[PDB]
């Protein structure tokens, strides 16, 4: 016995079994057919019913969020995420370095980012010279940025709007309010939840620690939008972009098409990779 084929999305992964939600808005547990590739939360599948179903086939993923293995290798932990929400705050102090890192991860994963200044209620006149400075570094790169407070409620209906129609992941250093933010947007391994205003979320303590490990220099360079356009124009195809004339990047910095705050963390980060 097996009912007809159906289209659905993966909600939870209970090892041998998988929680699956359909377009109808109904949930069912489905066993995993043997031949089937590895599945993660967010994946789109074909299944048949029987209250237990059988997952028959996996539909292509649009995107993948990976995470380091027990060994140290990257294995996917979520699928079909189209937005990564990078959350920082006035406290603890935000550094360009870690932000520039999460921005690279988002590029490596092939997923569009969205920066979030949480704890905007803590933006004193004292902080603003230092804060508006850093915000407008990513504002002038074309990146989406919102200033919010999961304490106040400041600009939360814009975030709910920014999250509408997307599948989103919440990522940032600990203590910026990731838990507080989820709870504010959802009052009551990777699991998938739906925002009441619209859009979905995939969450787990492991995905929250999602960031950047060791990669290639050419990966890192691709993580800088200013860079992507120029790379391959430095005359020296062997250019290291350091004291080298004919370095397109260098000329760009001079002209102001690269910001020194960025050209710095590029050096700091690349020199952290082996
Ligand atoms: N002042 C202020 N504090 C906040 C805000 N959002 C979160 N917090 C505080 O930040 C601290 C850490 O929050 P939490 O969600 O646990 O951070 P997480 O480690 O990133 O999940 C908590 O004590 C919260 O009260 C905010 O908008 N304003
Ligand atoms: Zn160069």
Instruction: Read off the CATH number of the domain in which 243 is found.
Output: 1.10.40.50
The pair of structure tokens assigned to 116 is: 């979030």
Q: Confirm whether residue 22 is marked as ligand binding.
A: no
Cα angle, residue 78 at apex, residues 20 and 200 outer, rounded to 5°: 65
**Residue appearing with tokens 């057919």:** 33
Backbone angles phi, psi at 162, to 5 degrees: -70, -25
Diameter of the chain by CA atoms?
72
Looking at the structure, tell me whether residues 112 and 188 fall in a common domain: yes
**Residue appearing with tokens 């929250």:** 208
Q: Confirm whether residue 95 is marked as ligand binding.
A: no
Compute the chain's Rg from CA coordinates.
Answer: 21
Nearest CA to ligand 1 atom 8: 177
| Inter-residue contact 64 to 78 (CB < 8 Å) | yes
Residues 6+ apart with CB under 8 A from 143: 103, 113, 115
Report the distance separating Cα 72 and Cα 249, nearest Å: 33
Structural biology method used: X-ray
CA 211 distance to own-chain centroid: 8
Ligand in nearest proximity to the CA of 235: 2
Which stretch of DSSP H or E encloses residue 11? Answer: strand 5-14
Report the distance separating Cα 82 and Cα 73, nearest Å: 23
For 141, the domain range is 61-212
Looking at the structure, tell me whether residues 169 and 232 fall in a common domain: no
| DSSP character at residue 155 | T
Looking at the structure, tell me whether residues 54 and 122 fall in a common domain: no
Report the distance separating Cα 206 and Cα 105, nearest Å: 15
Instruction: Residue 19: give its domain's CATH number.
Output: 2.40.50.140
Looking at the structure, tell me whether residues 185 and 153 fall in a common domain: yes
Nearest ligand 1 atom to alpha carbon 172: 20
Residues 6+ apart with CB under 8 A from 271: none
Looking at the structure, tell me whether residues 172 and 193 fall in a common domain: yes
Check residue 150 and give left, alpha or beta (phi > 0: left; psi -120 to 50: alpha). Answer: alpha
Domain limit, last residue, from 162, 192, 212: 212
Q: Given in angstroms, what resolution was this structure solved at?
A: 2.9
Looking at the structure, tell me whether residues 94 and 176 fall in a common domain: yes
Nearest ligand 1 atom to alpha carbon 150: 27
Residues 6+ apart with CB under 8 A from 231: 221, 222, 248, 249
Q: Confirm whether residue 241 is marked as ligand binding.
A: yes
Cα(89) to centroid(ligand 1), Å: 9
- Spell out a b/e string for 230-249, using b for 16 or more CB atoms within 10 Å of the CB, else e: bbeebeeeebebeeeeebbb
């Amino acid at each position: 016995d097996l009912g007809p084929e159906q289209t659905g999305q993966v909600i939870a992964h209970f090892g041998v079994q998988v929680e699956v939600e359909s377009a109808d808005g109904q949930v069912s547990r489905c066993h995993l057919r043997a031949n089937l590739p590895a599945l993660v939360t967010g994946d789109q599948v074909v299944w048949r019913a029987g209250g237990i179903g059988v997952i028959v086939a996996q539909l292509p993923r649009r995107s993948e969020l990976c995470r380091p293995d027990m060994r140290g290798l990257l294995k996917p932990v979520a699928a079909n995420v189209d937005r990564i929400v990078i959350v920082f705050a006035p406290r603890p102090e935000p550094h360009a370095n870690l932000i520039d890192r999460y921005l690279i991860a988002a590029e490596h994963a092939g997923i569009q980012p969205l920066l979030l200044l949480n704890k905007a209620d803590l933006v004193d006149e004292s902080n603003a010279e230092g804060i508006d400075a850093l915000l407008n570094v990513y504002r002038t790169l074309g990146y989406p940025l919102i200033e919010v407070s999961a304490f106040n409620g400041l600009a939360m209906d814009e975030l709910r709007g920014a999250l509408d129609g997307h599948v989103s992941v919440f990522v940032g250093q600990s203590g910026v309010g990731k838990s507080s933010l989820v709870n504010a947007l959802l009052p009551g391994t990777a699991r998938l939840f739906h925002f009441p205003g619209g859009g979905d979320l995939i969450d787990s303590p492991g995905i929250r620690e999602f960031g950047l490990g060791h990669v290639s220099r050419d990966d890192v360079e691709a993580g800088f939008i200013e860079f992507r356009d120029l790379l391959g124009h430095c005359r020296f195809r062997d250019c290291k972009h350091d004291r080298e004339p004919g370095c397109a990047l260098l000329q760009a910095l001079e002209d102001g098409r690269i910001m020194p705050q960025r050209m710095a963390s590029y050096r700091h980060i690349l020199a952290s990779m082996p």
